[PDB]
Amino acid sequence: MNTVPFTSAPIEVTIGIDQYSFNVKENQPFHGIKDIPIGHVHVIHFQHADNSSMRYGYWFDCRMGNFYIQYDPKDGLYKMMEERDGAKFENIVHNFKERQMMVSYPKIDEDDTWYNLTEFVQMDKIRKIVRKDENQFSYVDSSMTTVQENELSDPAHSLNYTVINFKSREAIRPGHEMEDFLDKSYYLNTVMLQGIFKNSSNYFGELQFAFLNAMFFGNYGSSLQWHAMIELICSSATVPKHMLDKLDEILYYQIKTLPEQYSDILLNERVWNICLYSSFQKNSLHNTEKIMENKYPELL
Amino acid sequence: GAMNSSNYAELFNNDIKLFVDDTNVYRVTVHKTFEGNVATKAINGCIFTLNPKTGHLFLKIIHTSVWAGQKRLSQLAKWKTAEEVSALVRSLPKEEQPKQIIVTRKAMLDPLEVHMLDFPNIAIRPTELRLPFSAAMSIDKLSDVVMKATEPQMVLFNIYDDWLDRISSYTAFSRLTLLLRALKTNEESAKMILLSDPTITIKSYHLWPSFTDEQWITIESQMRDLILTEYGRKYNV
Ligand SMILES: CNC(=O)CN(c1cccc(Cl)c1)S(C)(=O)=O
């Protein structure tokens, strides 16, 4: 079990660690989060109490280094850092643990939610979407735009998701215009899976990361990407059976975890109604269709 | 953006543009079978592609053989339209290619955009205008060439005859749309109006009669009356 220690909490903030959120008061004896499960990526995220427009966070994997959070009073945010001195960092964490100055990652043993939301998400792929090569962790916030959003304004601060555009030469073979527009299998299987992503695990990893960014930061660009990657599969008549079965599981857990009070903004009516009721895969997503119809029947 | 009443004069500026109407691409007669079921028989159709500034009508005849063995023909017809328009654009010299294509039915937007991906600078636009180009098959000479075709063919027509020697494009398009609206509302009456004076002949290479300026004013009035007449017959007004 690993630990993300904190300098202090000088400003009142809601702190998220994966799917949990807790409040820290201004100048409260708060030094961090312990018992973080090894083997998964994680996200530690923030919402300042005095400015709700300040929502940002860091994707990290504790197997890649020792990370700490330190408030920067000049830039006005909680920053993730790396301590290279392992001895000193292990000692720092031991002192905080002894003083009971850390909250404990509250994972229930029966619960596989975080694994199920991050099954295909890998830190190495995160670091290609979010380019900042001098750090081993990745910063994301609410306002960061995607490469595709920028094409339609600072490149170093963009989300480099794979561009998906159904009315593009990449998506449409000359001479197969109607075929490729009405059945996107070529674009899914040859262009995206074989060509760009190399395998379905990488495709699902980006899909899962996009969903989590949208849900944790209200990052509009991530929401657009998540739905586009769903629609590309659902709009393909020829999809491997194992990918469809895995997609159903992926989306079930995404819909299950989504905060009910954000469903109106996080779920695009057109895409979901199309995907569950009109598309080639309208009968392939049984678990997802069941949870959607029972939890959000209005949207449909 | 969409073409409407407010930006109507844009049709007659010097940016080359084409209207595309697909109404008459896929045409059928519905009939009973020997077992008492219903079936369709296709008949030849046409794409109506018109430059409203010059009167140029590139009438691509759609021969029934293109539907053989195909499914979902009403959907295929939109894609075949877009395929043929794209082919026409590619056949024209660069300085004759349109800067905008206006589709009369919004269901043509995606088929045409996808076929024109190689032409990112040609704008594909819908319209809020209710244009009467479906009535093109009420022009006798156009219907005749469509129905006699035994293979795919492109037939060229100027839909304004020589009117542009005497009137502007705006006035020519208005006359054309009035004539087509009349033919769409009451084809028999409209053709009677156009042919009431047999002394006014249609030239061999023309589509409409050789009316004088004064005669066109009378004809246009008679077509307006016809349209109002039919409006009252329909709505009991
Ligand atoms: C005031 N700045 C700090 O305390 C930063 N330091 C630190 C390193 C790892 C974890 C924590 Cl939590 C703090 S250090 C080494 O300077 O003490």
Ligand SMILES: CNC(=O)CN(c1cccc(Cl)c1)S(C)(=O)=O
């Ligand atoms: C009972 N209120 C709570 O916040 C309890 N929770 C929690 C509390 C502190 C830290 C963390 Cl990581 C979680 S939880 C697990 O239900 O979200």
Ligand SMILES: CNC(=O)CN(c1cccc(Cl)c1)S(C)(=O)=O
């Ligand atoms: C256009 N809306 C935005 O840029 C921001 N919003 C948003 C909307 C839909 C999905 C997502 Cl993730 C974010 S928000 C947080 O204001 O509701």
Ligand SMILES: CNC(=O)CN(c1cccc(Cl)c1)S(C)(=O)=O
């Ligand atoms: C000139 N050859 C024709 O058959 C008649 N015309 C024409 C019609 C449609 C398209 C083209 Cl490209 C030319 S015209 C120039 O006389 O008005």
